[PDB]
């Protein structure tokens, strides 16, 4: 068995994060869009 499956049989479990990789990617895309289209106005008020 792999390392994860061999360590889970002793109590050690890996909990999944709340924000998945897709949500972090969407957040980064939104930040990039705000930086390109607006600049610094979207981090201080209206875009």
């Amino acid at each position: 068995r792999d390392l994860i499956c061999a360590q889970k049989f002793k109590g050690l479990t890996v909990l999944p994060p709340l924000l998945t990789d897709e949500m972090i990617a969407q957040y980064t895309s939104a930040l990039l869009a705000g930086t390109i289209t607006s600049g610094w106005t979207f981090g201080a008020g209206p875009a």
């Binding site: 889970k8 479990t13 909990l15 999944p16």
Partner: peptide, 29 residues
């Protein structure tokens, strides 16, 4: 998962590391 004893008494059970086959139900990651 409990919304608080001051609001209601319903609870939700999450079994970490199962497939809804060895415990409505909802299968998540």
């Amino acid at each position: 998962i409990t919304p608080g004893t001051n609001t209601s008494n319903q609870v939700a059970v999450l079994y970490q590391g199962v497939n809804c086959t060895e415990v409505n139900v909802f299968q998540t990651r």
